[model samples]
Target: TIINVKCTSPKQCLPPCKAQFGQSAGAKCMNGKCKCYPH
Candidate 1:
């Protein structure tokens, strides 16, 4: 499932944020924020 999360900075975004979604998920910057989902 895809989920959108608000973050203060890229520091709070995906790559590291993938851990929150699970091993099958990934994330990227979108609209100046973070968007995560299963890949």
Candidate 2:
């Protein structure tokens, strides 16, 4: 899957970000993009 992809909403991006980054990792909708980061 593409990393740091664009997203429409939080719910739409949450699962994929979580799945890719893991439970402890965090995600934010930045400029309509989903950024997955380590906790």
Candidate 3:
């Protein structure tokens, strides 16, 4: 359902960051939340 996921810090967002369930990969960590970057 999701793919091509990336994160600012792999240690915190590895689950979705490395899921590879969409297209492209990029994200940010703030307030314990993951922000997905449009790619």
Candidate 2, residue 30: Cα displacement in angstroms equals 2.6
Alpha carbon lDDT of each predicted model: 0.62, 0.67, 0.50
Candidate 3 overall lDDT versus native = 0.50
The candidate with the higher lDDT, 1 or 3, is 1
Give, for candidate 1, the lowest lDDT window spanning 10 residues.
Answer: 1-10
Query: TM-scores of the models, in the given order?
Result: 0.40, 0.57, 0.38
Per-candidate clashes, comma-separated: 0, 0, 8
The full ranking of all candidates by TM-score, starting with the best, is 2, 1, 3
RMSD of each: 3.1, 3.1, 6.2
Q: Candidate 3's residue-wise lDDT over 1-39, tens digit each?
A: 232344456455535754553545565565455655556
Summarize candidate 1's per-residue lDDT along 1-39 as a digit string, tens digits.
445667666555665566876755666665566767666
Ranking by lDDT: 2, 1, 3
Residue 24 miss distance in model 1 (angstroms): 3.5
Q: Write the per-residue lDDT of candidate 2 for residues 1-39, one digit (tens) a residue.
A: 335688877566668877766875566675577766666
When summed lDDT is taken over every stretch of 10 residues in candidate 3, the lowest stretch is: 1-10
How many clashing pairs does model 3 include?
Answer: 8
Residue pair clashes in candidate 1: none
